[PDB]
Amino acid sequence: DAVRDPQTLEILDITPCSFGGVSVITPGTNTSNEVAVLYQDVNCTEVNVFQTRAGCLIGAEHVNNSYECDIPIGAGICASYQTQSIIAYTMSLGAENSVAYSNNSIAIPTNFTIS
Amino acid sequence: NQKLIANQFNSAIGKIQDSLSSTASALGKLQDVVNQNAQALNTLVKQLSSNFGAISSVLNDILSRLDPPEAEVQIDRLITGRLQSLQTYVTQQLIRAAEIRASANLAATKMSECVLGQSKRVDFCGKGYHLMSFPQSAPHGVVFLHVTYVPAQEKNFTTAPAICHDGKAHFPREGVFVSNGTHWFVTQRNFYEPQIITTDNTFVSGNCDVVIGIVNNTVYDPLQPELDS
Amino acid sequence: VTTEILPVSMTKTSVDCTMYICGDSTECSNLLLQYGSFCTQLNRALTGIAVEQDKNTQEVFAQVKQIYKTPPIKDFGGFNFSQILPDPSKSKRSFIEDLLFNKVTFNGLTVLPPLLTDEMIAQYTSALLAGTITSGWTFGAGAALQIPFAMQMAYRFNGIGVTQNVLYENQKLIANQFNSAIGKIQDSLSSTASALGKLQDVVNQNAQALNTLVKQLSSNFGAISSVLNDILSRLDPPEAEVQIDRLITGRLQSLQTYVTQQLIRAAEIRASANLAATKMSECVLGQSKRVDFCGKGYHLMSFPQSAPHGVVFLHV
Amino acid sequence: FTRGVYYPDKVFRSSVLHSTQDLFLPFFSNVTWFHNPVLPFNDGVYFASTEKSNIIRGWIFGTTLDSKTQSLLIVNNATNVVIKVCEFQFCNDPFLGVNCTFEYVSFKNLREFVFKNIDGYFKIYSKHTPINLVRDLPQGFSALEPLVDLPIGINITRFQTLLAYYVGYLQPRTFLLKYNENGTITDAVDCALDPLSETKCTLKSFTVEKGIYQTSNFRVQPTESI
Ligand SMILES: *[C@@H]1O[C@H](CO)[C@@H](O[C@@H]2O[C@H](CO)[C@@H](O)[C@H](O)[C@H]2NC(C)=O)[C@H](O)[C@H]1NC(C)=O
Ligand SMILES: *[C@@H]1O[C@H](CO)[C@@H](O[C@@H]2O[C@H](CO)[C@@H](O)[C@H](O)[C@H]2NC(C)=O)[C@H](O)[C@H]1NC(C)=O
Ligand SMILES: *[C@@H]1O[C@H](CO)[C@@H](O[C@@H]2O[C@H](CO)[C@@H](O)[C@H](O)[C@H]2NC(C)=O)[C@H](O)[C@H]1NC(C)=O
Ligand SMILES: *[C@@H]1O[C@H](CO)[C@@H](O[C@@H]2O[C@H](CO)[C@@H](O)[C@H](O)[C@H]2NC(C)=O)[C@H](O)[C@H]1NC(C)=O
Ligand SMILES: *[C@@H]1O[C@H](CO)[C@@H](O[C@@H]2O[C@H](CO)[C@@H](O)[C@H](O)[C@H]2NC(C)=O)[C@H](O)[C@H]1NC(C)=O
Ligand SMILES: *[C@@H]1O[C@H](CO)[C@@H](O)[C@H](O)[C@H]1NC(C)=O
Ligand SMILES: *[C@@H]1O[C@H](CO)[C@@H](O)[C@H](O)[C@H]1NC(C)=O
Ligand SMILES: *[C@@H]1O[C@H](CO)[C@@H](O)[C@H](O)[C@H]1NC(C)=O
Ligand SMILES: *[C@@H]1O[C@H](CO)[C@@H](O)[C@H](O)[C@H]1NC(C)=O
Ligand SMILES: *[C@@H]1O[C@H](CO)[C@@H](O)[C@H](O)[C@H]1NC(C)=O
Ligand SMILES: *[C@@H]1O[C@H](CO)[C@@H](O)[C@H](O)[C@H]1NC(C)=O
Ligand SMILES: *[C@@H]1O[C@H](CO)[C@@H](O)[C@H](O)[C@H]1NC(C)=O
Ligand SMILES: *[C@@H]1O[C@H](CO)[C@@H](O)[C@H](O)[C@H]1NC(C)=O
Ligand SMILES: *[C@@H]1O[C@H](CO)[C@@H](O)[C@H](O)[C@H]1NC(C)=O
Numbered sequence: 001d002a003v004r005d006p007q008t009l010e011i012l013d014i015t016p017c018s019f020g021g022v023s024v025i026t027p028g029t030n031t032s033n034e035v036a037v038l039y040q041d042v043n044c045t046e047v048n049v050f051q052t053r054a055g056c057l058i059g060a061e062h063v064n065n066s067y068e069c070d071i072p073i074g075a076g077i078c079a080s081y082q083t084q085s086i087i088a089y090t091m092s093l094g095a096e097n098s099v100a101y102s103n104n105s106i107a108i109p110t111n112f113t114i115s
Numbered sequence: 116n117q118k119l120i121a122n123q124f125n126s127a128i129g130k131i132q133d134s135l136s137s138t139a140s141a142l143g144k145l146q147d148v149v150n151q152n153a154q155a156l157n158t159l160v161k162q163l164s165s166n167f168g169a170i171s172s173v174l175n176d177i178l179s180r181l182d183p184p185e186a187e188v189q190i191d192r193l194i195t196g197r198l199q200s201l202q203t204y205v206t207q208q209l210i211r212a213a214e215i216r217a218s219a220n221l222a223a224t225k226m227s228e229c230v231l232g233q234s235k236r237v238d239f240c241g242k243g244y245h246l247m248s249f250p251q252s253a254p255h256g257v258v259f260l261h262v263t264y265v266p267a268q269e270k271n272f273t274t275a276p277a278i279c280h281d282g283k284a285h286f287p288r289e290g291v292f293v294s295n296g297t298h299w300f301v302t303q304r305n306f307y308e309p310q311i312i313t314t315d316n317t318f319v320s321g322n323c324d325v326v327i328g329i330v331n332n333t334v335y336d337p338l339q340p341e342l343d344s
Numbered sequence: 345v346t347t348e349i350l351p352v353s354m355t356k357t358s359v360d361c362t363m364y365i366c367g368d369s370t371e372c373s374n375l376l377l378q379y380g381s382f383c384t385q386l387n388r389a390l391t392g393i394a395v396e397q398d399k400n401t402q403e404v405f406a407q408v409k410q411i412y413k414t415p416p417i418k419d420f421g422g423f424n425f426s427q428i429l430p431d432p433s434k435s436k437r438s439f440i441e442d443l444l445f446n447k448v449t450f451n452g453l454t455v456l457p458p459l460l461t462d463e464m465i466a467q468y469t470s471a472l473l474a475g476t477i478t479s480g481w482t483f484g485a486g487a488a489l490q491i492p493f494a495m496q497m498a499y500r501f502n503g504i505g506v507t508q509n510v511l512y513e514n515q516k517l518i519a520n521q522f523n524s525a526i527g528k529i530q531d532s533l534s535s536t537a538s539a540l541g542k543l544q545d546v547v548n549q550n551a552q553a554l555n556t557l558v559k560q561l562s563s564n565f566g567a568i569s570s571v572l573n574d575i576l577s578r579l580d581p582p583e584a585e586v587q588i589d590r591l592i593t594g595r596l597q598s599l600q601t602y603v604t605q606q607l608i609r610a611a612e613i614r615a616s617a618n619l620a621a622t623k624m625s626e627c628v629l630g631q632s633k634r635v636d637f638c639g640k641g642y643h644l645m646s647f648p649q650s651a652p653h654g655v656v657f658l659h660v
Numbered sequence: 661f662t663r664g665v666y667y668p669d670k671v672f673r674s675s676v677l678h679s680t681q682d683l684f685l686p687f688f689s690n691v692t693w694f695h696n697p698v699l700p701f702n703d704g705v706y707f708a709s710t711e712k713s714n715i716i717r718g719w720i721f722g723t724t725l726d727s728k729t730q731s732l733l734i735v736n737n738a739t740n741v742v743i744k745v746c747e748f749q750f751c752n753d754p755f756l757g758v759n760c761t762f763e764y765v766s767f768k769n770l771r772e773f774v775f776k777n778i779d780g781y782f783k784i785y786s787k788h789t790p791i792n793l794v795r796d797l798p799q800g801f802s803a804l805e806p807l808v809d810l811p812i813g814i815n816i817t818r819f820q821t822l823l824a825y826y827v828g829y830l831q832p833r834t835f836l837l838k839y840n841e842n843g844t845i846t847d848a849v850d851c852a853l854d855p856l857s858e859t860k861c862t863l864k865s866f867t868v869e870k871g872i873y874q875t876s877n878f879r880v881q882p883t884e885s886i
Binding site for chain 2: 385486489494513589604618
Binding site for chain 4: 017018019020021022023024025026027028029030031033035037038039040042046047070071072073079081
């Protein structure tokens with residue numbers, strides 16, 4: 001955990017060197033040979049760079065627009081290939097649709113389909 | 116709507132054929148079972164080529180090259196590695212089998228409740244109101260075609276929990292009161308089909324001073340015109 | 345109102361089998377490779393579980409294709425849902441959800457984040473709750489069709505064999521009993537930490553599994569030393585390899601034990617996730633007629649709440 | 661480019677992707693381009709040459725290459741290939757105009773060779789093909805079959821070429837080799853070239869489906885020693 005320096009009477013902590021798994025985000029080689037690389041659970045200072053909770057993501061462009069998830073990274077972030085480059089975005093959970101609720105109104109279907 | 120319903124059904128089946136023909140991944144669940152089992156055996160066989168600390172992965176080379184007092188030691192290393200490999204494989208097969216057993220139990224449950232009957236369980240037999248289902252065979256599994264009723268075009272109606280007639284509070288026996296802006300009707304809950312509100316559609320309980328949101332209306336009595344005529 | 349708690353997911357622990365056994369050691373790694381796929385398939389087994397854990401969360405919570413929202417005016421016929429609806433002034437979670445969260449707590453071992461973060465689960469439970477309150481079961485089966493809340497309850501009462509006139513005549517009483525019952529849930533969860541013991545237990549079992557795995561590194565397994573660097577510093581290869589081989593067998597065996605336990609435990613959690621998904625589909629989106637499926641009594645409705653590593657249902 | 665691949669063994673494989681580690685020329689690495697210097701042998705040599713008039717005749721492999729110890733002399737003189745491992749005395753600058761333990765006697769073109777010396781055996785692989793290119797090596801892929809296997813028992817650290825040609829060096833890298841129905845290698849992946857190649861080797865497929873895959877482990881390396 002820590003050692004005493006034999007020449008100087010001081011105590012030094014030993015912190016093992018940063019490491020983590022490396023994952024490659026691939027759009028699929030049928031469309032593109034471009035990939036983005038995720039260094040899991042590390043800071044980008046040790047490794048078009050985006051720092052996320054899941055690690056340091058390199059090569060993917062961060063986009064402010066939300067999209068449905070395609071290739072998941074983690075912690076709310078997914079990757080995709082769009083018009084072309086690899087991008088990262090916060091995933092959308094679904095379409096927003098407020099309900100027109102009131103105390104005197106009911107919606108009743110007038111037609112149906114069989115699926 | 117029998118002609119409409121039959122046509123929608125027939126169209127939907129044609130869509131299933133196109134979906135299955137177009138995308139193989141539709142059956143990814145069955146392909147995945149096949150892939151995992153195949154991988155488990157490829158892994159098991161590949162392990163025969165490992166030394167596991169032995170001088171050689173080949174049993175015959177150990178036996179013909181080393182004198183028995185030493186060959187036995189090298190063999191014990193191969194036996195431990197190969198025996199351990201089988202134990203790993205078997206444990207994985209048993210755990211994987213538990214997953215498949217659970218799936219099979221679910222599949223059996225669905226066939227009994229979804230195919231042989233008419234389930235009332237929501238999203239048990241797909242999204243929508245379950246009508247019926249049909250089983251199909253498949254490699255190492257079962258495929259169900261779930262036929263469901265899904266509400267489609269809809270309208271915004273004004274409503275009320277009850278109506279006031281002679282001060283009596285009338286409630287629908289099996290429906291909801293609606294208004295198109297000028298007239299009140301009673302309609303079945305899942306399909307707009309307005310009917311004249313009559314004593315044969317509603318029942319009386321309590322009065323207008325109790326029900327919150329009760330509105331004024333006229334309830335038709337089919338008997339009075341007959342008594343008068 | 346009763347509370348039922350079901351675990352949905354495990355901590356996504358991922359283990360680097362090479363670093364675990366042969367941390368920063370070339371000589372050890374060369375020997376480890378003699379075991380073929382014994383190391384690699386363990387990394388694979390754990391990866392498969394981590395993926396499964398995200399699958400479990402999605403099957404339970406992502407049952408709605410749209411994010412529904414309640415109106416600014418809570419005109420729900422006297423029924424007070426503000427204790428289960430998200431608080432916009434804060435993490436967009438309800439009072440009860442905050443109570444639920446506050447009651448549950450370098451060896452090649454890392455933990456991956458879930459795909460859906462706590463605020464995203466909160467959005468899903470918010471959508472399901474908004475759907476349940478403003479459109480009953482139709483947001484489940486088809487489109488979310490607005491219905492007055494008191495009227496929705498009328499349907500729920502007929503669904504258990506009680507003529508809806510009972511609801512309207514006693515609407516004030518029913519709303520008051522409901523509001524009181526939710527308040528009781530807040531007090532029960534605030535006071536009794538053990539209320540969420542099922543979620544805490546999953547966390548504790550996984551913590552023990554990892555603590556055991558790490559402690560095994562201190563074992564000699566017949567070697568002169570549990571420390572790989574000491575063997576390498578003291579002995580020349582002709583013998584060092586023997587001492588290392590003893591550690592590799594013991595440490596590889598330790599991982600196999602760990603992974604097997606994680607896979608069996610994962611099967612248990614998966615079963616719970618499947619049950620949770622089933623209850624949400626049949627209990628929240630619909631109206632179950634299955635006895636004691638949605639607590640004691642005749643089922644009228646239920647509301648999902650998010651929780652650490654799982655889901656909590658309030659059954660009415 | 662993608663050349664410097666040879667059949668690692670004498671085993672027939674078909675319709676299969678085989679992962680192996682051996683000394684291969686790393687893909688897209690630099691090779692020294694020559695138009696008679698003494699070069700290092702290192703762990704093995706990738707040699708390639710182009711011809712119009714059969715200028716390159718042979719090679720010398722050894723240590724001192726000065727009648728002090730044993731060395732390999734491989735020369736194709738007019739019509740007959742001669743291989744000798746004698747303790748030869750060589751010229752200050754050997755060229756061709758217009759104690760022995762082993763002896764054997766047998767731009768428009770490209771001749772590729774791989775020379776490696778492992779455990780006393782000198783392995784020679786080669787490939788011949790027509791070309792139409794003056795400036796550089798052609799881009800494309802082929803694998804070199806073994807031709808000669810000499811039980812020399814001789815240490816090689818340096819070599820020289822006897823008279824354009826290219827010299828590269830082999831490294832212990834993993835490759836994924838694609839075998840066709842006829843037992844030949846039609847493609848290859850250098851598993852340490854880039855992150856996509858790493859993915860292909862991990863999945864053991866020349867094409868990969870969309871998704872995220874774990875392929876390796878990042879480790880910060882020590883820079884000093886205390
Ligand atoms: C319910 O919707 C269906 C369409 O999904 C209607 O059927 C269509 O009617 C149009 C004419 O308006 C025709 O051109 C289409 O060919 C019909 N389609 C099919 C499949 O029959 C149907 O009439 C609607 N029903 C009600 C009661 O409004
Ligand atoms: C509500 O429905 C009633 C019944 O269909 C509508 O009243 C009828 O309107 C038609 C003209 O479109 C007349 O020919 C009928 O004689 C009316 N019936 C009665 C009983 O008055 C009424 O117009 C609809 N209201 C709205 C706002 O759409
Ligand atoms: C339904 O109709 C009745 C009359 O038939 C309404 O009763 C009136 O209530 C107001 C308010 O208390 C009194 O000032 C009137 O004198 C009452 N009328 C009669 C004839 O007694 C009742 O308010 C109506 N309700 C709704 C919801 O419209
Ligand atoms: C729902 O119940 C909550 C209590 O849990 C009500 O919030 C309180 O409102 C009163 C004013 O009427 C304030 O004085 C309290 O300080 C509030 N308490 C908290 C904890 O915020 C809420 O108003 C009720 N809503 C409805 C629609 O009945
Ligand atoms: C049904 O039981 C409820 C209590 O659970 C009764 O409501 C209470 O009535 C007393 C008077 O006797 C009041 O002091 C309480 O404040 C009421 N409680 C609530 C929540 O409203 C109700 O009256 C009973 N109904 C019948 C028909 O007996
Ligand atoms: C995807 O693969 C098919 C062959 O199965 C090919 O025809 C198609 O062009 C490929 N897609 C792209 C974008 O190149
Ligand atoms: C990552 O490094 C930056 C410096 O560039 C530092 O500000 C930040 O706090 C670090 N984060 C972690 C989690 O170490
Ligand atoms: C997102 O918007 C913020 C401003 O709120 C801006 O600073 C940031 O650079 C934007 N990011 C991208 C990827 O557009
Ligand atoms: C009902 O009214 C709302 C507005 O409150 C509107 O957005 C919705 O489309 C209407 N529905 C129908 C079927 O007209
Ligand atoms: C419905 O809401 C309106 C607007 O707040 C209110 O005036 C009316 O009395 C309410 N009716 C019922 C039955 O709740
Ligand atoms: C090649 O050189 C050898 C001597 O090493 C000689 O015996 C042979 O005849 C020569 N061949 C030709 C074709 O010149
Ligand atoms: C051959 O080797 C012997 C030593 O065994 C040495 O005495 C002799 O001089 C060598 N001959 C030549 C031609 O180098
Ligand atoms: C090659 O070098 C080794 C020392 O690393 C030596 O023992 C061996 O005898 C040498 N081989 C020859 C043929 O001189
Ligand atoms: C194998 O060789 C035959 C000629 O004997 C050729 O026709 C065939 O196309 C070759 N197959 C492949 C896969 O190259």
